[PDB]
Coordinates of all heavy atoms in Angstrom, one line a residue:
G15 N -63.1 13.4 73.7 CA -63.9 13.5 74.9 C -64.8 12.3 75.1 O -65.6 12.2 76.1
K16 N -64.8 11.3 74.2 CA -65.6 10.1 74.3 C -64.8 9.1 75.1 O -65.5 8.2 75.6 CB -65.9 9.6 72.9 CG -66.8 10.6 72.1 CD -67.3 9.9 70.8 CE -68.1 10.9 69.9 NZ -69.2 11.5 70.7
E17 N -63.5 9.2 75.1 CA -62.7 8.2 75.8 C -62.1 8.8 77.1 O -61.2 9.7 77.0 CB -61.6 7.7 74.9 CG -60.8 6.5 75.4 CD -59.7 6.1 74.5 OE1 -58.6 6.6 74.5 OE2 -60.0 5.1 73.7
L18 N -62.5 8.3 78.2 CA -62.0 8.8 79.5 C -61.4 7.7 80.3 O -61.6 6.5 80.0 CB -63.1 9.5 80.3 CG -63.8 10.7 79.7 CD1 -64.8 10.3 78.7 CD2 -64.3 11.6 80.8
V19 N -60.6 8.0 81.3 CA -59.9 7.0 82.1 C -60.3 7.0 83.5 O -60.7 8.0 84.0 CB -58.3 7.2 82.0 CG1 -57.8 6.7 80.7 CG2 -57.9 8.6 82.3
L20 N -60.3 5.8 84.1 CA -60.7 5.7 85.5 C -59.5 5.3 86.3 O -58.8 4.3 86.1 CB -61.8 4.6 85.6 CG -62.1 4.2 87.1 CD1 -62.8 5.3 87.8 CD2 -63.0 2.9 87.1
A21 N -59.2 6.2 87.3 CA -58.1 6.0 88.2 C -58.5 4.8 89.2 O -59.3 5.0 90.0 CB -57.8 7.2 89.0
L22 N -57.8 3.7 88.9 CA -58.1 2.5 89.7 C -57.4 2.6 91.0 O -57.9 2.1 92.1 CB -57.7 1.2 88.9 CG -58.0 -0.1 89.6 CD1 -59.5 -0.3 89.8 CD2 -57.4 -1.3 88.8
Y23 N -56.2 3.1 91.0 CA -55.4 3.3 92.2 C -54.9 4.8 92.3 O -54.8 5.4 91.3 CB -54.2 2.4 92.2 CG -54.5 0.9 92.2 CD1 -54.2 0.2 91.0 CD2 -55.0 0.3 93.3 CE1 -54.6 -1.2 91.0 CE2 -55.4 -1.0 93.2 CZ -55.1 -1.8 92.1 OH -55.4 -3.1 92.1
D24 N -54.7 5.3 93.5 CA -54.3 6.6 93.7 C -52.8 6.8 93.4 O -52.1 5.8 93.6 CB -54.6 7.1 95.2 CG -53.6 6.5 96.2 OD1 -53.7 5.3 96.5 OD2 -52.8 7.3 96.7
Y25 N -52.4 7.9 92.9 CA -51.1 8.2 92.6 C -50.6 9.6 92.9 O -51.3 10.6 92.6 CB -50.8 7.9 91.1 CG -49.4 8.1 90.6 CD1 -48.4 7.2 91.1 CD2 -49.0 9.1 89.8 CE1 -47.1 7.4 90.7 CE2 -47.7 9.3 89.4 CZ -46.8 8.4 89.8 OH -45.5 8.6 89.4
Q26 N -49.5 9.7 93.6 CA -48.9 10.9 94.0 C -47.9 11.4 92.9 O -47.1 10.6 92.5 CB -48.2 10.8 95.4 CG -47.6 12.1 95.8 CD -48.6 13.2 96.0 OE1 -49.8 13.0 96.3 NE2 -48.2 14.5 95.8
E27 N -48.0 12.6 92.6 CA -47.1 13.2 91.6 C -45.6 13.2 92.1 O -45.3 13.9 93.1 CB -47.5 14.7 91.3 CG -46.6 15.4 90.3 CD -46.8 16.9 90.4 OE1 -47.8 17.4 89.8 OE2 -46.0 17.6 91.0
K28 N -44.8 12.5 91.5 CA -43.4 12.4 91.9 C -42.5 13.4 91.1 O -41.4 13.8 91.6 CB -42.8 10.9 91.7 CG -43.7 9.9 92.4 CD -43.9 10.1 93.9 CE -42.6 10.0 94.7 NZ -42.8 10.3 96.1
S29 N -42.9 13.7 89.9 CA -42.2 14.7 89.1 C -43.2 15.6 88.4 O -44.3 15.2 88.2 CB -41.3 14.0 88.1 OG -42.0 13.2 87.2
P30 N -42.9 16.8 88.1 CA -43.8 17.8 87.5 C -44.4 17.4 86.2 O -45.4 18.0 85.8 CB -42.9 19.1 87.3 CG -41.8 18.9 88.2 CD -41.5 17.4 88.3
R31 N -43.8 16.4 85.5 CA -44.4 15.9 84.3 C -45.6 15.0 84.6 O -46.4 14.6 83.7 CB -43.3 15.1 83.5 CG -42.2 16.0 82.9 CD -41.3 15.1 82.0 NE -40.6 14.1 82.7 CZ -40.1 13.0 82.2 NH1 -40.2 12.8 80.8 NH2 -39.5 12.1 82.9
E32 N -45.7 14.6 85.8 CA -46.8 13.7 86.3 C -47.9 14.6 86.9 O -47.9 15.8 86.9 CB -46.2 12.8 87.4 CG -45.1 11.9 86.9 CD -44.3 11.3 88.0 OE1 -44.9 11.1 89.1 OE2 -43.1 10.9 87.8
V33 N -48.9 13.9 87.4 CA -50.1 14.6 88.0 C -50.7 13.7 89.1 O -50.7 12.4 88.9 CB -51.1 14.9 86.9 CG1 -51.7 13.7 86.3 CG2 -52.2 15.8 87.6
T34 N -51.1 14.3 90.2 CA -51.7 13.6 91.3 C -53.2 13.2 91.0 O -54.0 14.1 90.6 CB -51.7 14.4 92.6 OG1 -50.3 14.6 92.9 CG2 -52.3 13.6 93.7
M35 N -53.6 12.0 91.1 CA -54.9 11.5 90.8 C -55.4 10.7 92.0 O -54.7 9.9 92.5 CB -55.1 10.8 89.5 CG -54.4 9.4 89.5 SD -54.5 8.6 87.9 CE -53.7 7.0 88.3
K36 N -56.7 10.9 92.4 CA -57.3 10.1 93.4 C -58.0 8.9 92.8 O -58.6 9.0 91.7 CB -58.2 10.9 94.3 CG -57.7 12.2 94.8 CD -56.4 11.9 95.6 CE -55.9 13.2 96.3 NZ -55.8 14.3 95.4
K37 N -57.9 7.8 93.5 CA -58.6 6.6 92.9 C -60.1 6.8 92.9 O -60.7 7.2 93.9 CB -58.2 5.3 93.8 CG -58.7 5.4 95.2 CD -57.9 4.3 96.0 CE -58.1 2.9 95.5 NZ -59.6 2.5 95.6
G38 N -60.7 6.4 91.8 CA -62.2 6.6 91.7 C -62.5 7.8 90.8 O -63.7 7.9 90.4
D39 N -61.5 8.6 90.4 CA -61.8 9.7 89.6 C -61.8 9.4 88.1 O -61.1 8.5 87.6 CB -60.7 10.8 89.8 CG -61.1 11.7 91.0 OD1 -61.8 12.7 90.7 OD2 -60.6 11.5 92.1
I40 N -62.6 10.1 87.4 CA -62.7 9.9 85.9 C -62.0 11.1 85.3 O -62.4 12.3 85.4 CB -64.2 9.9 85.4 CG1 -65.0 8.8 86.0 CG2 -64.2 9.8 83.9 CD1 -64.5 7.4 85.6
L41 N -60.9 10.8 84.6 CA -60.0 11.8 84.1 C -60.1 11.9 82.5 O -60.4 10.9 81.9 CB -58.5 11.6 84.5 CG -58.3 11.4 86.0 CD1 -56.8 11.1 86.2 CD2 -58.7 12.7 86.7
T42 N -59.9 13.1 82.0 CA -60.0 13.3 80.6 C -58.6 13.1 79.9 O -57.6 13.6 80.4 CB -60.5 14.8 80.3 OG1 -61.7 15.0 80.9 CG2 -60.6 15.0 78.8
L43 N -58.6 12.3 78.9 CA -57.3 12.0 78.2 C -56.9 13.2 77.3 O -57.7 13.8 76.6 CB -57.5 10.8 77.3 CG -57.5 9.5 78.1 CD1 -58.0 8.3 77.2 CD2 -56.2 9.2 78.7
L44 N -55.6 13.4 77.3 CA -55.0 14.4 76.4 C -54.0 13.8 75.4 O -53.7 14.4 74.4 CB -54.2 15.4 77.3 CG -55.0 16.2 78.3 CD1 -54.1 17.0 79.2 CD2 -56.1 17.1 77.7
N45 N -53.5 12.6 75.8 CA -52.6 11.9 74.9 C -52.5 10.4 75.3 O -52.5 10.1 76.5 CB -51.2 12.5 75.0 CG -50.2 11.7 74.2 OD1 -49.5 10.8 74.7 ND2 -50.0 12.1 72.9
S46 N -52.6 9.5 74.3 CA -52.5 8.1 74.5 C -51.6 7.4 73.5 O -51.8 6.3 73.2 CB -53.9 7.5 74.4 OG -54.8 8.0 75.4
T47 N -50.5 8.1 73.1 CA -49.6 7.5 72.2 C -48.5 6.7 73.0 O -47.4 6.4 72.5 CB -48.9 8.6 71.4 OG1 -48.5 9.7 72.1 CG2 -49.8 9.0 70.2
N48 N -48.8 6.4 74.3 CA -48.0 5.6 75.1 C -48.8 4.5 75.7 O -50.0 4.6 75.9 CB -47.4 6.5 76.3 CG -46.5 7.5 75.8 OD1 -45.7 7.3 74.8 ND2 -46.4 8.7 76.5
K49 N -48.1 3.4 76.0 CA -48.7 2.2 76.7 C -48.4 2.2 78.2 O -48.9 1.4 78.9 CB -48.2 0.9 76.0 CG -46.7 0.6 76.4 CD -46.2 -0.6 75.8 CE -44.9 -1.1 76.4 NZ -43.9 0.0 76.4
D50 N -47.5 3.1 78.6 CA -47.0 3.1 80.0 C -47.6 4.4 80.7 O -48.0 4.3 81.9 CB -45.5 3.1 80.0 CG -44.9 1.9 79.3 OD1 -45.0 0.8 79.9 OD2 -44.4 2.0 78.2

């Protein structure tokens, strides 16, 4: 909970594995074992 991410650009969920985020939102990380 010390490391959070900032949505720089908005993104629409294209597949159920994804999630819709609005630009400017601070999101909580659940996994960062990926660079992509």
Side-chain angles (χ1 to χ4, degrees):
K16 298 189 180 305
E17 186 181 88
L18 299 82
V19 287
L20 172 64
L22 183 61
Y23 299 109
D24 75 288
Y25 181 68
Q26 180 61 30
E27 179 198 281
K28 307 303 295 179
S29 63
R31 290 186 299 159
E32 304 165 21
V33 63
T34 300
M35 68 180 182
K36 307 307 186 308
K37 64 195 302 296
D39 272 276
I40 301 294
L41 305 177
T42 306
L43 286 169
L44 302 172
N45 177 268
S46 296
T47 44
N48 292 328
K49 72 181 192 308
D50 301 285

